[PDB]
Amino acid sequence: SHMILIKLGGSVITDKSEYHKFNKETVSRLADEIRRSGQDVMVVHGAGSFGHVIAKKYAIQDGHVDDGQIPAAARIMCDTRELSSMVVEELLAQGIPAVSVAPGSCFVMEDGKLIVDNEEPIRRLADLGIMPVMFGDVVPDRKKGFAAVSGDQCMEVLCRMFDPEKVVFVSDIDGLYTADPKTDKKARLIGEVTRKKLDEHSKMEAMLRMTDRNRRCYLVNGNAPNRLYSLLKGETVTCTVAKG
Amino acid sequence: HMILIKLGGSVITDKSEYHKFNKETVSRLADEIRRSGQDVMVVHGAGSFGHVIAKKYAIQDGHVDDGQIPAAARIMCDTRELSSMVVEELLAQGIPAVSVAPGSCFVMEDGKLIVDNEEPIRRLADLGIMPVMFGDVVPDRKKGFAAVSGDQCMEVLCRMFDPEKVVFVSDIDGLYTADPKTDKKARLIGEVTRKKLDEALTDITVADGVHSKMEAMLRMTDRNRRCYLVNGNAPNRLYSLLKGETVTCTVAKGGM
Numbered sequence: 142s143h144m145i146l147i148k149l150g151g152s153v154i155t156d157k158s159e160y161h162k163f164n165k166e167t168v169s170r171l172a173d174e175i176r177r178s179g180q181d182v183m184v185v186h187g188a189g190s191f192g193h194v195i196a197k198k199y200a201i202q203d204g205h206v207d208d209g210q211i212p213a214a215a216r217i218m219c220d221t222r223e224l225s226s227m228v229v230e231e232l233l234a235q236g237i238p239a240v241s242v243a244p245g246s247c248f249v250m251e252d253g254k255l256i257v258d259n260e261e262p263i264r265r266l267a268d269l270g271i272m273p274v275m276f277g278d279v280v281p282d283r284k285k286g287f288a289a290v291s292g293d294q295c296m297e298v299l300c301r302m303f304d305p306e307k308v309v310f311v312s313d314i315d316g317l318y319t320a321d322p323k324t325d326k327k328a329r330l331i332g333e334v335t336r337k338k339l340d341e342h343s344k345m346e347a348m349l350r351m352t353d354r355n356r357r358c359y360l361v362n363g364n365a366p367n368r369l370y371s372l373l374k375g376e377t378v379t380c381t382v383a384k385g
Numbered sequence: 386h387m388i389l390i391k392l393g394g395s396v397i398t399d400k401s402e403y404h405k406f407n408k409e410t411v412s413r414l415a416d417e418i419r420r421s422g423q424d425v426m427v428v429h430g431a432g433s434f435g436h437v438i439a440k441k442y443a444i445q446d447g448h449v450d451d452g453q454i455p456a457a458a459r460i461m462c463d464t465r466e467l468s469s470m471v472v473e474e475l476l477a478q479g480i481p482a483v484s485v486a487p488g489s490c491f492v493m494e495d496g497k498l499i500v501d502n503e504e505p506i507r508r509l510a511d512l513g514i515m516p517v518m519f520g521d522v523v524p525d526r527k528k529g530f531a532a533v534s535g536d537q538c539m540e541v542l543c544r545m546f547d548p549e550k551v552v553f554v555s556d557i558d559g560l561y562t563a564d565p566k567t568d569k570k571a572r573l574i575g576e577v578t579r580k581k582l583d584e585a586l587t588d589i590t591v592a593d594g595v596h597s598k599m600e601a602m603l604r605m606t607d608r609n610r611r612c613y614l615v616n617g618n619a620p621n622r623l624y625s626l627l628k629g630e631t632v633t634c635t636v637a638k639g640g641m
């Protein structure tokens with residue numbers, strides 16, 4: 142019961158300012174860091190520039206309103222699946238058996254909720270040692286035609302099915318700050334996140350939901366070499382932790 | 386008025402060279418589909434994106450040792466990457482499509498592909514985003530994992546969506562009395578029925594061929610829906626068949 146659920150956010154695996162650009166060097170290092178830690182893990186990744194660009198250009202997250210969005214949805218779904226291959230290639234190269242599980246090809250959505258009615262394939266892939274890799278995708282919706290699922294929602298489902306000991310968000314920031322550290326030089330790192338969120342980004346809300354059953358959720362900078370490796374081994378690193 | 390089409394691995398890949406995609410052939414076949422103007426749904430095989438590694442690790446035998454797991458995930462990645470290449474050509478010709486990997490959402494039991502949840506595949510077809518299934522490694526309820534073929538993917542979609550016509554696209558003009566690559570004096574079979582399938586059942590067939598290929602087409606047929614096996618390497622032959630014209634092919638009929 143010591144599995145660690147990891148999200149390779151789109152901020153580190155892709156260049157979000159450059160459409161369809163894969164950060165092969167960062168993902169290759171992150172996969173090597175994952176293997177050397179010797180931990181049992183499951184990998185979710187974001188869509189990044191392989192989806193967010195065409196998404197809001199056609200407002201895909203708002204549902205099916207025009208037939209012109211159908212080729213756009215297919216192109217987005219083709220890109221997220223292609224990105225997942227590049228991620229899986231790096232996992233396989235390190236000796237981590239993994240397979241892409243596209244949510245848009247397997248599940249449906251209803252009122253912003255990812256619905257996983259059939260859990261057997263994901264569970265059977267896990268028991269075989271072939272890590273099921275979910276990711277942000279365009280998903281059929283029961284009310285809006287289609288919708289968008291995030292990497293965080295995919296993790297919430299896997300957090301429910303497999304009860305990880307730790308949950309780790311890998312992004313391009315040292316942690317949660319008072320504001321965007323890229324735009325506000327007067328940003329200060331927040332070390333702990335509890336239900337003290339009552340004072341107020343909304344990432345505290347996203348981190349806290351996965352702290353069910355006294356497990357700790359971490360948010361760490363993947364652009365810092367070996368930080369993720371040390372985190373997985375239990376060594377103290379710079380990060381934001383959600384607890385309680 | 387939907388037509389179910391299998392883009393076999395023998396024509397969309399170089400089956401003699403691992404991980405080799407025949408882009409231009411697929412680009413032509415997609416353009417022939419667009420030019421036909423038919424409501425279609427496309428399944429494709431794995432070809433050398435699945436068979437080469439499956440033979441070296443006996444994946445068709447199921448989970449027998451831990452050395453197979455890295456090979457199974459390697460094939461699973463290869464079939465998904467090949468499917469992306471196929472979808473890319475479909476999108477280029479104005480055919481919205483999405484890859485639906487059977488190993489990512491289905492299981493198998495006793496050599497049959499179990500589809501317990503039909504909603505996603507049906508919702509994608511309703512939106513106009515063609516669900517494209519393909520040959521893959523699939524978790525098995527009894528043997529750990531199992532290999533599913535394009536022919537089996539075609540069966541469940543035939544069961545699900547009830548096409549009026551089924552087309553098998555391969556690297557051969559049709560079914561022959563023996564393998565045409567190893568027998569020059571072999572002739573083509575024009576029509577396939579349940580009667581001739583029993584006529585092709587031999588001891589060699591049992592110990593294995595042509596009987597299983599006939600059975601694959603016959604399972605796509607019923608009282609009036611026919612199955613056609615056409616050569617994808619013949620330019621515009623798939624186009625003419627989709628238009629309703631007569632072409633050199635093998636026809637299955639009557640069901641079984």
Ligand SMILES: Nc1ncnc2c1ncn2[C@@H]1O[C@H](COP(=O)(O)OP(=O)(O)O)[C@@H](O)[C@H]1O
Nearest residue numbers: 150151152187312316317318319320321323342
């Ligand atoms: N209060 C904040 N603390 C930390 N980062 C923030 C904050 N507000 C905005 N950001 C920005 O959000 C980005 C990460 O969010 P996002 O890219 O959506 O996550 P993901 O990496 O999962 O896609 C960071 O690059 C950071 O610049």
Ligand SMILES: Nc1ncnc2c1ncn2[C@@H]1O[C@H](COP(=O)(O)OP(=O)(O)O)[C@@H](O)[C@H]1O
Nearest residue numbers: 393394395430555559560561562563564566595
């Ligand atoms: N009786 C037969 N008739 C036609 N082809 C045969 C026969 N026996 C063996 N073959 C071989 O099978 C090959 C096609 O089979 P396969 O690759 O499974 O089709 P697909 O590519 O549609 O899956 C042909 O290249 C042919 O050489």
Ligand SMILES: [C]/C([C][C]N=N=[N])=[C]\[C]OP([O])([O])=O
Nearest residue numbers: 187188196201277289291292
């Ligand atoms: C996929 C998405 C969207 C795009 N397209 N559309 N509607 C998102 C996900 O999320 P992330 O962030 O995790 O990546």
Ligand SMILES: [C]/C([C][C]N=N=[N])=[C]\[C]OP([O])([O])=O
Nearest residue numbers: 430431435520521532534535
């Ligand atoms: C997945 C694969 C591999 C295995 N092997 N076997 N029995 C294949 C697919 O299928 P196709 O259709 O391609 O042939």
